[PDB]
């Protein structure tokens, strides 16, 4: 029948949310991606509203954890059983962290019988041998040995991350089942047009210790994921031409390629932080063919 | 045309605290004044009160810190979410995303030094009922666990986690000196036999025995949707229907007023029992004197 028109939310870069961590977006970055594998499992959705990988709709439940917790005796560590069918054809529980690193946050527990509440500094290492979210359990190191009760509802809320810039590695996927392979992964992403690179929506993660690599790049904003999921407009071409427009003056600053699979590319060469007006937004104009040459932007 | 997004209750986010919604509640509201300043938005996409669009930037705090010597407390001067200054000339009650209730909010204060990349994080709390809680003047105070670590002229973020609270009592945005200004109006059922419909979450607790119930008038996703679509209200009331997608059967109906709140036909407190896959659906525009069928 008649096609539903395609659209992108009218929002500036600083009004949208990063889809790989529950923080706002900060800038637009571009750089070569051949030296590393870009395969995030969050913020993955096709343009017609089909979620991929471990991507869901709620922007708060990113890198969060929920369940019941058992103390590892002799340590300040605790094991959380996740609340989960391992049979769903997904790489890991929805919202699982899709990068290797040490995430700091708060473990909060509630005791049902009377309403007691508890909170403690927790950390989870996604590259740890005891990080098996696909199997239904993860490990947190806390600051207590007796405070968290058994089989009480416990929530992990993330905050940030803990040789300089050797951690966290954002382009290295965790092993969801352990050390002895991942399944149902979203495809890796690379620009298949000469002179084109990926355009990353970049945020700065909060740091809690040391000298961490606080850059976090996502292919699609969370608001874009929610919008694509809602509208479910079919892709009439393989790539959709988006133009960055100034709403006051109407001047176009640059144009980009929005691929139907769910990533953006620009015509540039080299690492570059895009300088844009604070009120600029992305506007959809047309569906372009496979031979479309983007006008390059400095 | 007008519409509401096809989402279940448990898939949406509370607009007064960055946490997922949990249930639907309804009850009498005569014994308290319902005037929240977050999660307020007209149906044609006009934000009211201290409401903005980011669902993660609710109850957060950004700026620079100064140490109160002899204590573990700190004083943060506020910057807008774009890292610009908070301009108190803005005809808003307080910086957008400000907590709109009295209580102690626990969280983490994180700081980064620009030159070398040193980072620190510390347990912090902010009391919205305190004398030094004056966001409208561009200043808040934080109770920390350190007296030495946080530096000056360095960007600092406060991310909330939970409470240690009077949910329906607004803070004094400029302190105990002045009154609050440009408040979103209080809502109440103006039709006989009707009650308000609250989207209810349970706030995390980190100490003590706090009352963790938090009700919002609109889910944050509804606010984003209304702001994006900008559909003009053709009537005083928008008739919504909660529908089970498996069978198509209507569970109940409710009235979405153009100012931004929902009412149901009920009498007495009740936590609504709903199917997990149900969603709200817009059907038509009806007048204010439309009698809803009783809600189970």
């Amino acid at each position, epitope marked *: 029948s008649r096609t539903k028109p395609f659209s992108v939310p*009218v929002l500036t870069v600083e009004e949208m949310t990063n889809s790989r961590f529950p923080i706002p977006l900060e800038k637009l970055f571009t750089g070569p991606s051949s030296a590393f594998v870009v395969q995030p499992q969050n913020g993955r959705c096709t343009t017609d509203g089909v979620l991929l990988g471990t991507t869901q709709l709620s922007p708060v439940n990113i890198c969060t954890f929920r369940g019941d917790v058992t103390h590892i005796t002799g340590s300040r560590n605790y094991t959380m059983n996740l609340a989960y069918d391992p049979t769903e054809e997904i790489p890991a529980p929805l919202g699982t962290p899709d990068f290797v690193g040490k995430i700091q946050g708060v473990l909060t527990q509630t005791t049902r019988t009377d309403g007691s509440t508890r909170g403690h500094k927790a950390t989870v290492y996604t590259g740890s041998a005891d990080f098996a979210p696909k199997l239904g359990r993860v490990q947190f190191e806390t600051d207590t040995d007796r405070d968290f009760e058994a089989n009480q509802n416990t929530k992990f809320t993330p905050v940030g991350v803990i040789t300089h810039r050797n951690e966290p590695q954002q382009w290295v996927l965790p092993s969801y089942s352990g050390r002895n392979h991942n399944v149902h992964l979203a495809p890796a992403v690379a620009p298949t047009f000469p002179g084109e690179q990926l355009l990353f929506f970049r945020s700065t993660m909060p740091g809690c210790s040391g000298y961490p690599n606080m850059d976090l790049d996502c292919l699609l904003p969370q608001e874009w994921v929610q919008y694509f999921y809602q509208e479910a407009a079919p892709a009439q071409s393989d790539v959709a031409l988006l133009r960055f427009v100034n*709403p*006051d003056t109407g001047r176009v600053l640059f144009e980009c390629k929005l691929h139907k699979s769910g990533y953006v590319t620009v015509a540039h060469t080299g690492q570059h932080d895009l300088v844009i007006p604070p009120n600029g937004y992305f506007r959809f104009d047309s569906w372009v063919n496979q031979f479309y040459t983007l006008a390059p932007m400095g | 045309p007008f519409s509401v997004p096809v989402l279940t209750v448990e898939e949406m986010t509370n607009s007064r605290f960055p946490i997922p919604l949990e249930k639907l509640f309804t009850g009498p509201s005569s014994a308290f004044v319902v005037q929240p300043q977050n999660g307020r938005c007209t149906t044609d996409g*006009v934000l*009211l009160g201290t409401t903005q669009l980011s669902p993660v930037n609710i109850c957060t705090f950004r700026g620079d810190v100064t140490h109160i010597t002899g204590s573990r407390n700190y004083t943060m001067n506020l910057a807008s979410q774009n890292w610009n200054d908070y301009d108190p*000339t803005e*005809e808003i009650p307080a910086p957008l995303g400000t907590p709109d209730f009295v209580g102690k909010i626990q969280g983490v204060l994180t700081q980064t030094t620009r030159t070398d990349g040193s980072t620190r994080g510390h347990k912090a709390t902010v009391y919205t009922g305190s004398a030094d809680f004056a966001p409208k003047l561009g200043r808040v105070q934080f109770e920390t666990d350190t007296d030495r670590d946080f530096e000056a002229n360095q960007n600092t973020k406060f991310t909330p986690v939970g409470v240690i609270p009077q949910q329906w009592v607004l803070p004094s945005y400029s302190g105990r000196n002045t009154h609050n200004v440009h408040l979103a109006p209080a809502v109440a059922p103006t039709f006989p036999g009707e009650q308000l419909l609250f989207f209810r979450s349970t706030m995390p607790g980190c100490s003590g025995y706090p009352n963790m119930d938090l009700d919002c008038l609109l889910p944050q996703e509804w606010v984003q949707y209304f702001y*994006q679509e900008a559909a003009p209200a053709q009537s005083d009331v928008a008739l919504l229907r909660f529908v089970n997608p498996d069978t198509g059967r209507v569970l109940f109906e409710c009235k979405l007023h*153009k*100012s931004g709140y929902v009412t149901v036909a009920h009498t007495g407190q009740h936590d609504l029992v709903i199917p997990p896959n149900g969603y709200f659906r817009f059907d038509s525009w009806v007048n204010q004197f439309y009698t809803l069928a009783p809600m189970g």
Partner: nanobody
Amino acid sequence: QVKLQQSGGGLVQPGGSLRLSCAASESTISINTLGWYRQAPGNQRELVATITTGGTTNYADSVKGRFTISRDNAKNTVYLQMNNLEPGDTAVYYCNLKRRDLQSRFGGYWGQGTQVT
């Protein structure tokens, strides 16, 4: 969503005075900025006056002292009293409303221009 209706145009001769009015229509009255802009033949559109619900006024440096903006919240109406008019004031004067919605990013809401000669 928002409707604006202006009135008060005409022709004066140098040294004269006139008054424009603009009434707004909203489903729910908002905290907003009501103002006047103007565009001259072959010229860019420029600001002449704004006022908020709280009363904050902003004037263009060319019209300070001669032009006076006024507001009525209960009637949601903005008035512009232009005294000591210049031949350089011949232009189309537009009424503008800016509230906290998406449209505000594209310049707010506009009324039908009013010619001033």
